[model samples]
Target: GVEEVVNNKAKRLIDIYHAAVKELIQNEELIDLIDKHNVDYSVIESIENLPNLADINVKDDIDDVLSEIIKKKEVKIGALKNKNWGIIGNYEQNPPVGFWPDVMYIIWETISKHIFNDEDAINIAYNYYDNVFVALNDKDIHMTDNYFLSNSRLVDQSGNNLPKLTSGLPIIKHSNKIMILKEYNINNLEDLKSYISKNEGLKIACLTEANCNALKNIFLDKVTYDYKSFSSYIDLSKSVLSKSHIIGVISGIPFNFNEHKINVFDSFLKTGHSAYFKAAA
Candidate 1:
């Protein structure tokens, strides 16, 4: 019974030691460098071949000073092995994405809870739905909805703070136009104001008369610069020129300006925008 107790205690100690060593390895600057540089996969596979602990022998040593040196050498080897194994485990759990977490929380709340039977679809959604930009800009995936409420806040039914859908609001892409799409449920200016509060980072730049009036009626407090105040188009542009980031909200894609167009209409039916109809067809 005493031998069994000793064995259990020693095993527990070894487990704790292994976990501690693994943590140390994971926190090492070498691991950060490997992750930062995007090191080759083969090196991770070869990690097991790192020098073994058998090379260390303190069994015959009675000298405290010499054994202390051996103790550190053993610790160094143990740390190295544990660190390598840590990398292996991390790689197994999460294969590298170009550069990638909380999207999982959003998916679970918005998409995952609604779907049943085909859980793998959640994984498929996760790949694309992780960021608002990726969902919109990714040409291959083709996300279902084209109308997005950008520079917005999201909340769950119980009124907890949810992650904003976009990585950077009004992503300057597609030749200077911000293209945000994929499944926005906002129906009116009332619904719009609920999510998109005043924020310093991005301003809602409504170009069309309809959207401009609608936003001004309900969201005048939120708009940084009232584009309506300026007499000319040039002056209107200049009014907000100092604030670089604004979502140029139009009913549909505007061809008049070769740059800075965005589609903020909730749906094609609502705006009667040809671009949305073309996209739907």
Candidate 2:
């Protein structure tokens, strides 16, 4: 019971910080414009590193700390350059095409939740233990999504150096002419109807489930619900994305769990670009 109790509290600690990061990233504008330099996923991995959330009773204090993390800017972490990265050991094929270490932070946070609130939490779970690697520009955008782990001090309940896993947050580079996709920015149900009618095409439409469903609801008024989608991160990341002439929202946090795919489209984006005649829908 004590183990469960502490661990549950640890999860609360996880949610506390997770909630804050999600809030910050919810602003599509902020995240769309967020340079790879501004997001430090390695540091983002540690809830213990957030400082004071484990001890602080108030929520805003936690938000303030995470806000600082989200606001961080670094040159570029060497996720590709480094080889043998514990869980993501393969250096070439999966080198650094995508990185979502924030998801790893969530993984590390969840696995170490039990010890997270402890006095030496930082020392054992982070600080002296955790090594940070973050990302870059054009040649670097490919490496920008790197979220590999090098936690020598971390081991799971099974005692593995880091748990075996995969998080597919493919960081795609926006070439000079690439237009950053933003939400439809509709006013309400009325605008959405007109918006959908005007933007018709056989395309890969991506938006939050809520937004998609909302549109689907209004869509019932004019069309059918024959659309389809998949949240297979591994398969999605594993497949080669052809950015030749397509547009859609591709894109997260606890913070990035790699768990949120609908609202989380990147390297690419979140938009209303719909299904084609022969599309997968």
Candidate 3:
């Protein structure tokens, strides 16, 4: 009886997931992304094997697991790698160094607390683990630095959850590679031009904006993910790129950044669908 309920729901999840997934094959960039990451395309169907609530233990649940992992400042716990329900924790620093901390933050703060029941929390948690970690059969894809949703916190209209530089300045450093804008001491246009001149063939983002005033020099290109709220809407349009996904927000434990403890809101990005800024400012 339990199998029937769990299996039935997995199929339903697949049924709903198919709408967005089917389109991925046609997207060359996404295909390139998958190939670059070595993510196995067939793994989406494996969600059907997701264990039931009865199968998972209380220790594996979000509240219990995070309570223990968050116990220390920098313990790298392993749950997903062992095929058990797991993620990394980093109470140690802001933009904490592992996949688990951010994932756990998203779960406790947003997924379990505000969005879904405890049962669905387990579902969403493992689902994210499987896709982000397990989906890549290739050991070389390097999950952490590669995918933003797999590693970083979500950015939205709210600035509170987003990390600001400890400098107390209103600027956030652009660490993303494509920005190749990095060699400069961020916000230094004159120096950045020399850095950009030295490099070539590095793909750049945020070039096209519908607003002429917002283009290039005047505005710093901050990549904010435009997510679909699946619980509220069916995600009418989907972006062919990985930039968009469905994300939810909630508050998390304060994290230390350059001796200043910064409080943040958590976002459920693992299960998100993609979207774009149509007006493009």
Candidate 4:
């Protein structure tokens, strides 16, 4: 039940994040780096293999590669059908082009450039995708709807005080080394507030002022923010949810633990498991 709950919460948050990023790509205010950079958009094989697609022109090839990848990878392209609610559809019949493909594109571009020299075509593709991902993650008008409403606020079965994952009291593990785990569900904001008030050790870190206030207000408390002194105090939070689970849940890929042979992408693409998408989804 705990795993199920955790997964369900993660899935919902992923959806929200996906929707938010998608909206960002569609905004006129945001610059279209892919178009601007004149990156070739043809999908080759892996994001890291820029040299493979280097022969093509920087602009046209980049777009062609990207377009090809989207087609091959089943990336959605179009308009948002349900702006009011924040739900995105699949590649073929989706409402609008959202952020995922853009984000992937940016990642592809950045990683390619870093790995290969500024192979113009690859660089353009990578940059385009990376910018898209950042825009979606960073603060924006659509973020409130996507992140705050969808991922914020946690409630127990009774529907009470607990805030959501990103907003609520993140589970901290700092006995020896500091690490934040996945969050737990609570009844209402008041419950989280009360818990924080009683525990002086549980201090808030670099969160938005509004989120900090929400935490304090519901619980009636104050937090100290020593940006300089608290530099090493914060640590990377590990998702309590397993990597296999996160990848599977987010990408809809299936796991085959026994089949762990290193593929061509793993050996030549990028070091470690970063380059491989799940084989079966």
Candidate 5:
């Protein structure tokens, strides 16, 4: 019965995906990832030293040119690189470093505690081996210079500004290239309430049926609720009225819930039947 069914639409959709994949393979930029480095550093460096300016104007000209080149390099690197997920541990540092093996180990331990149900130390070992490869690959694209600071016009290499000598470091310095980890301090219920009030839009106070009353009591102290209760509303919005237009929130989930999470964006766009349809049909 399955074989007998004439699914011309499905066949056409498959053809479209085949053509798209073939085109992507042929794309010069996408294909260049076979080798890690996309651009030739030597060629870039040589171009940076071009003798277009006289000796008097050379230093400024070179700095300007190199700065532009570095910006381009950052863009290219970010575009080609894959997104990584790691746990934010109880680290005091405002900005963390990706180069630290111990940070990676901490993340590993945290994930393993939840995912694998392994003991803390064993989880560390498991995650370390699994994540080390990805961390190492990330090192290739990681910039030593502060990406944000370099783009800003605040300070120069010699630390001189337009007028005054500021005591604080430049928004971005070479040392600021480290990774970041966010920390939230919730000492008591009052602290938690203050945190929620400060970050209203971003925070979601999730509650199970068992702890619903406890959650309500805590929330009532600091905030007001229009609805009877804030439950996970799947289909409709109780408090906030539905907008006339549709909005989408795109996300990439790392692992599988049942099987494993794949790129839904790529899968839907590439394989959806509407992508390829005969005009008459």
Candidate 6:
């Protein structure tokens, strides 16, 4: 009887989903219907009462709800906040910024067009959102300023989805508290030494993915500088203090630099990761 009950329940759900697929194919109008933004999604409310189904609609399925939110580019922050989804800081401001644009770009350019399926893309989008916005709500983080997303698993490569890791999720850069070497117009060892004398702390240097690739074979006489990747904010701090041989760190994303003090053609490449040369020796 127990086995029979389970079989019956599974059949009911399969039947319902088969009918849904049939309906989708039979009605071409539903295809265009999803393209419109003004459609009444509340019509799905009836599915809330459905039985013998694992998931029916937004109230039960988080992926469905997030997919709807991503497609619409709007969300009820109040409802989400009440659901303990974590605080959405300043989302309702005048400009009303959301990470939807970044998510969409990753999906369209990176996941959808290149590597993964629509379902996995949606999963990545929601996972990234939960990881960054929900987890860092109180940590004073910002999108596109202090951190950003990249499709590359490696700093020099592109089109691969970012790996799901806590520390390496959103690429965090060295904050302004760290003095950037680019600002001092340092061209050689002499210039770097003069600038280093003025700055007391660790003199941080940077390179773009392009420049790193261009000079990888010859730069610093091809001397290995204790290369590391996916270095997080805390990871980098500890490294700066502990690793005496690490002159620079390479990462998957670029760091945000102070615009006023630095500019292009200053011998500071702003494309890839932080790295070191043998100049200090």
Rank order by lDDT, top first? 1, 2, 6, 4, 3, 5
Better of 1 and 3 by lDDT: 1
What is the per-residue lDDT of model 5 for residues 32-119, given as tens digits with 9 covering 90 to 100? 3222322111101112222221122211133332223223421101111222223312122323323222323332333233223442
Poorly placed runs, candidate 2 (over 4 Å)? 1-11, 19-34, 37-54, 57-97, 106-214, 217-221, 228-281
**Clash number for every model?**
1, 23, 8, 39, 2, 3
lDDT values, one for every candidate: 0.30, 0.29, 0.25, 0.26, 0.25, 0.29
**Model 4 residue 20 lDDT score:** 28
What value does the lDDT take at residue 219 in candidate 4? 33
State every prediction's TM-score relative to the real structure.
0.20, 0.26, 0.20, 0.19, 0.16, 0.22
Question: How far in Å is the alpha carbon of 252 misplaced in model 5?
Answer: 13
How good is model 5 by TM-score? 0.16
Model 2 scores a C-alpha lDDT of 0.29
Tens-digit lDDT string for candidate 2 (1-281): 35432112123333443443433344342243234435422222223333332353433244322222222321122333344333323334431222233332333243233333332222111111122211111112211122332212233344544322212222212211111122344323355446657765424333224323433433453433221353543323222133211223223222222232222332311222110010000
Summarize candidate 3's per-residue lDDT along 158-218 as a digit string, tens digits: 4233222111111011111111112234333344445445654322222112111122232
Candidate 6 residue lDDT tens string, 147-234: 2322223211233423211122121111112222343464443454464455544423223233233224334433333324323544
Model 1: per-residue lDDT, tens digit, 1-281?
35432212112212222232233234453345346644321112132322222232223253332233223321110000111223222212232122111212222222222222231323422222323332223222322121122322333345554332222111111111222221234444454555567344446554444445444545565665344544444433443343442434443342333233322333221221100000111
Q: Pick the candidate with the highest TM-score.
A: 2
In the predicted model 5, the residue pairs found to clash are: 149-172, 256-260
Per lDDT, the best of the predicted structures is 1
Higher-scoring candidate on TM-score, 3 or 4:
3
Give the per-residue lDDT of model 4 (tens digit) for 1-281.
35433222223222322332233334421235434433222121222322223232222133322333323432221122234322221223322233333434443343234334442333212111212212223311111111122123233345553332232111111011111222322233344446545656444432233322333333344454322222221111112123211100011112322223211011011101111111111
Clashing pairs in 6: 208-271, 208-272, 209-272
TM-score of 3: 0.20
